Design an enzyme around this catalytic site. Structure first.
Site, PDB file in Angstrom:
ATOM      1  N   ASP A 159      14.801  47.112  22.893  1.00 45.72           N
ATOM      2  CA  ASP A 159      16.093  47.022  22.050  1.00 45.72           C
ATOM      3  C   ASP A 159      17.084  46.561  23.255  1.00 45.72           C
ATOM      4  OD1 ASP A 159      17.555  47.101  19.855  1.00 45.72           O
ATOM      5  OD2 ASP A 159      18.048  49.230  20.126  1.00 45.72           O
TER       6      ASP A 159
ATOM      7  N   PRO B  53      23.412  43.374  24.177  1.00 48.26           N
ATOM      8  CA  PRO B  53      24.554  43.546  24.938  1.00 48.26           C
ATOM      9  C   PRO B  53      25.117  45.083  25.122  1.00 48.26           C
ATOM     10  CG  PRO B  53      24.866  41.496  23.772  1.00 48.26           C
ATOM     11  CD  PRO B  53      23.536  42.279  23.078  1.00 48.26           C
TER      12      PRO B  53
ATOM     13  N   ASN C  72      23.614  47.664  25.123  1.00 44.54           N
ATOM     14  CA  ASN C  72      22.624  48.516  25.719  1.00 44.54           C
ATOM     15  C   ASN C  72      22.653  47.918  27.258  1.00 44.54           C
ATOM     16  OD1 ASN C  72      22.050  50.176  23.626  1.00 44.54           O
ATOM     17  ND2 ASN C  72      20.196  49.361  23.056  1.00 44.54           N
TER      18      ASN C  72
ATOM     19  N   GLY D 144      30.104  56.805  22.694  1.00 44.03           N
ATOM     20  CA  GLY D 144      29.041  56.152  21.987  1.00 44.03           C
ATOM     21  C   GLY D 144      28.443  57.089  21.008  1.00 44.03           C
TER      22      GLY D 144
ATOM     23  N   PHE E 201      27.249  57.283  35.120  1.00 38.53           N
ATOM     24  CA  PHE E 201      28.324  56.505  34.148  1.00 38.53           C
ATOM     25  C   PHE E 201      28.574  55.101  34.791  1.00 38.53           C
ATOM     26  CE2 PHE E 201      32.814  55.379  33.558  1.00 38.53           C
ATOM     27  CZ  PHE E 201      32.775  55.600  32.078  1.00 38.53           C
ATOM     28  N   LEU E 202      28.531  54.312  33.947  1.00 35.39           N
ATOM     29  CA  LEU E 202      28.960  52.924  33.936  1.00 35.39           C
ATOM     30  C   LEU E 202      30.438  52.526  33.268  1.00 35.39           C
ATOM     31  CD1 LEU E 202      25.942  52.877  34.712  1.00 35.39           C
ATOM     32  CD2 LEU E 202      26.368  50.724  35.317  1.00 35.39           C
TER      33      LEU E 202
HETATM   34  N1  LIG Z   1      26.801  51.295  24.250  1.00 37.67           N
HETATM   35  C1  LIG Z   1      27.936  51.710  25.058  1.00 37.67           C
HETATM   36  C2  LIG Z   1      28.310  53.215  24.942  1.00 37.67           C
HETATM   37  S1  LIG Z   1      26.958  54.116  25.237  1.00 37.67           S
HETATM   38  C3  LIG Z   1      27.134  54.254  27.130  1.00 37.67           C
HETATM   39  N2  LIG Z   1      28.326  53.800  27.605  1.00 37.67           N
HETATM   40  C4  LIG Z   1      28.262  53.687  29.138  1.00 37.67           C
HETATM   41  N3  LIG Z   1      29.235  53.102  29.501  1.00 37.67           N
HETATM   42  C5  LIG Z   1      30.290  52.180  29.106  1.00 37.67           C
HETATM   43  C6  LIG Z   1      31.285  52.726  28.275  1.00 37.67           C
HETATM   44  C7  LIG Z   1      32.180  53.443  28.854  1.00 37.67           C
HETATM   45  C8  LIG Z   1      33.391  53.924  28.374  1.00 37.67           C
HETATM   46  C9  LIG Z   1      33.709  53.747  27.083  1.00 37.67           C
HETATM   47  N4  LIG Z   1      34.736  54.356  26.331  1.00 37.67           N
HETATM   48  C10 LIG Z   1      35.658  54.730  27.135  1.00 37.67           C
HETATM   49  C11 LIG Z   1      36.550  55.269  26.092  1.00 37.67           C
HETATM   50  C12 LIG Z   1      35.864  55.130  24.699  1.00 37.67           C
HETATM   51  N5  LIG Z   1      34.788  54.453  24.965  1.00 37.67           N
HETATM   52  C13 LIG Z   1      32.708  52.947  26.222  1.00 37.67           C
HETATM   53  C14 LIG Z   1      31.617  52.381  26.898  1.00 37.67           C
HETATM   54  C15 LIG Z   1      27.540  54.478  29.619  1.00 37.67           C
HETATM   55  N6  LIG Z   1      27.337  54.913  30.795  1.00 37.67           N
HETATM   56  N7  LIG Z   1      26.072  55.543  31.237  1.00 37.67           N
HETATM   57  C16 LIG Z   1      25.420  55.751  29.861  1.00 37.67           C
HETATM   58  C17 LIG Z   1      24.223  56.438  29.694  1.00 37.67           C
HETATM   59  C18 LIG Z   1      23.105  55.807  29.287  1.00 37.67           C
HETATM   60  C19 LIG Z   1      22.600  56.550  28.376  1.00 37.67           C
HETATM   61  C20 LIG Z   1      23.956  57.352  28.818  1.00 37.67           C
HETATM   62  C21 LIG Z   1      26.203  54.996  29.058  1.00 37.67           C
HETATM   63  N8  LIG Z   1      26.315  55.003  27.882  1.00 37.67           N
END
Ligand SMILES: NCCSc1nc(NCc2ccc(-n3cccn3)cc2)c2[nH]nc(C3CCC3)c2n1
EC number: 2.7.11.22
Lengths: 285, 258
Positions: free
Chosen positions: A118, A121, A123, A11, A73-74
């Site tokens: 904020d 979806p 977030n 992100g 991590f999710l």
């Molecule tokens: N707005 C979504 C992006 S920011 C995000 N995404 C997360 N996980 C979803 C995700 C996982 C892998 C991928 N991916 C793989 C390869 C390329 N992209 C993309 C989305 C997070 N899990 N925990 C967090 C903490 C809260 C603040 C950081 C967190 N943030």
């Protein structure tokens, strides 16, 4: 930082990373510090997440001085899950589970005097076990009882409540409920309920669906700073057309989450008691 | 009433106990005194007026200072640097438009550099472990104001004035929780303007009787009676403004008849 192996950028900066010693997979949120020192967004996100320990709120694990916030991590966000489900649709029991869990998370925020401001979806984070969690508290604020005037420039446009668009002096918890009403509809219909391309287009998209509000629906509305008596007067559409797949209970809850009058809009706590949730389960996506 | 007002009050009552500074910390500070603290707090009142900052921002900054001085020895030459970093952090947390660091440097008349203010910000954050969302006298006062029968702008202005005077004098006000100071400030303001007392609805909400508030009330009555003589006068000057219904010009009651 020597103990973290960056895996990839997820992100923007948020990285997927691995603790080299424990194997724990984390999300690293890097905050750049370059002339005003630690950004207000970081100060608020850290201080407020330290008081927001709940199964439906993302966990902050550590803070390291650059500034790195270490989070759980999710696997996915609700926006990408929605995109992947555009052809199939999200099963009704999973829509209900996700909304129930978002409302538990949000009720906890409001009970701890935190506004998210904020909810959209991208977030909202989902794991392989059927949990969903509120994330990104960079736009959040600790509010007072009663509220005073806060930042006007708040919530991503498509999810922004009418009392913000019409410039009310005061907004509070009802703005988060508005955003979740929008997200509920979006899960049901597979598209954004109010995809505005400007503040005026956003308002008119709302008015065209829910009817142009008047002094009976929303006492004070015709006095609001950005209200114009020239606004077209549209009639309210039948929820059978707005959210066709949704049952009577679903329609009742959505209508209460999208009430024009913030004083009458349902609270997170009251939404959890709605008959829509009588048979709620926790399916796995 | 919103169905989270009670939950927030219960939560703020738990957090005020956890965010409390160490009551006797000033006796362990080798180089600073209650009087130097009073001077710093009175100065922050003036900074708040100059930058049109919220009362809440001032209350938070004082919570951050007392918590920092609870675990860190500070020489008198650096006390203003702690205060400045505290006010910068309080502003970033609470204010829509916080003043820029260069303005905090200007308001110290270049006593400190930008680098010093930014390094002190990092240190305050470290010492407070980023726990900035502290309950304040102000946060309890605004909740208590909803119980007025009926709402009286002079009562609100005077209760705020009184709660602010409590910030100046670590002896005796560090002995009391924010909820209790707010209770005394509200009762004393009500009694002064209208002759009414701490209302039954707040006895039920808070569990505080007029009797439980008495020790704090007696302290705050003396503070009120002696305010025109105090060495620190920035709060009296502030609450003369029409913004605050000139309440600092009102005569304190001679007795409280408790
Ligand atoms: N707005 C979504 C992006 S920011 C995000 N995404 C997360 N996980 C979803 C995700 C996982 C892998 C991928 N991916 C793989 C390869 C390329 N992209 C993309 C989305 C997070 N899990 N925990 C967090 C903490 C809260 C603040 C950081 C967190 N943030």
């Amino acid at each position: 930082m020597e103990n973290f192996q960056k895996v990839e950028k997820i992100g923007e900066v948020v990285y997927k990373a691995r603790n080299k010693l424990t194997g724990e997979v984390v999300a690293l949120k890097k905050i750049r510090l370059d002339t005003e020192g630690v950004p207000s967004t970081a100060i608020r996100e850290i201080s407020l997440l330290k008081e927001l320990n709940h199964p439906n709120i993302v966990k902050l694990l550590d803070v390291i001085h650059k500034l790195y916030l270490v989070f759980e991590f999710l696997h996915q966000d609700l926006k990408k899950f929605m995109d992947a489900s555009a052809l199939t649709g999200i099963p009704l029991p999973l829509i209900k589970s996700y909304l129930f869990q978002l409302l538990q998370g949000l009720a906890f925020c409001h009970s701890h005097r935190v506004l998210h401001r904020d909810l959209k979806p991208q977030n909202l984070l989902i794991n392989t076990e059927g949990a969903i969690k509120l994330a990104d508290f960079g736009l959040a604020r600790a509010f007072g009882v009663p509220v005073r005037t806060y930042t006007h420039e708040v919530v991503t446009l498509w999810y922004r409540a009418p009392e913000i668009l019409l410039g009310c002096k005061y907004y509070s918890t009802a703005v988060d409920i508005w955003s979740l009403g929008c997200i509920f509809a979006e899960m049901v219909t597979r598209r954004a309920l109010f995809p505005g391309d400007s503040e005026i287009d956003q308002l008119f998209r709302i008015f065209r669906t829910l009817g142009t509000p008047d002094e009976v629906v929303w006492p004070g509305v015709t006095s609001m700073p950005d209200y114009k008596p020239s606004f077209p007067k549209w009639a309210r559409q039948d929820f059978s057309k707005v959210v066709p797949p949704l049952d009577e209970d679903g329609r009742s809850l959505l209508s209460q989450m999208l009430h024009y009058d913030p004083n009458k809009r349902i609270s997170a706590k009251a939404a959890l008691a709605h008959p829509f949730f009588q048979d709620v389960t926790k399916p796995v996506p | 009433v919103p169905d989270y007002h009670e939950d927030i009050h219960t939560y703020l009552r738990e957090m005020e106990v956890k965010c409390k500074p160490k009551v006797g910390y000033m006796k362990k500070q080798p180089d600073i005194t209650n009087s130097m603290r009073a001077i710093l707090v009175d100065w922050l009142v003036e900074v708040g007026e100059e930058y049109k900052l919220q009362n809440e921002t001032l209350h938070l900054a004082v919570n951050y200072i007392d918590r920092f001085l609870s675990s860190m020895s500070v020489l008198r030459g650096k006390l203003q640097l702690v205060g400045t970093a505290a006010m910068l952090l309080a502003s970033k947390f609470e204010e829509i438009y916080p003043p820029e660091v260069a303005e905090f440097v200007y308001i110290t008349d270049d006593t400190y550099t930008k680098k010093q203010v930014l390094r002190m910000e990092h240190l305050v954050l470290k010492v407070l472990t980023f726990d900035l969302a502290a309950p304040t006298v102000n946060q309890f006062l605004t909740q208590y104001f909803l119980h007025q029968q009926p709402a009286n702008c002079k009562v609100e202005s005077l209760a705020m004035f009184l709660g602010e005077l409590s910030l100046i004098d670590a002896d005796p006000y560090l002995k009391y929780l924010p909820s209790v100071i707010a209770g005394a400030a509200f009762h004393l303001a009500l009694y002064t303007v209208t002759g009414q007392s701490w209302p039954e609805s707040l006895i039920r909400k808070t569990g505080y009787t007029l009797e439980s508030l008495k020790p704090c009330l007696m302290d705050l009555h003396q503070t009120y009676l002696k305010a025109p003589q105090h060495a620190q006068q920035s709060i009296r000057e502030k609450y003369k403004n029409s913004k605050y219904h000139g309440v600092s010009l009102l005569n304190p009651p001679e007795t409280l008849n408790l």
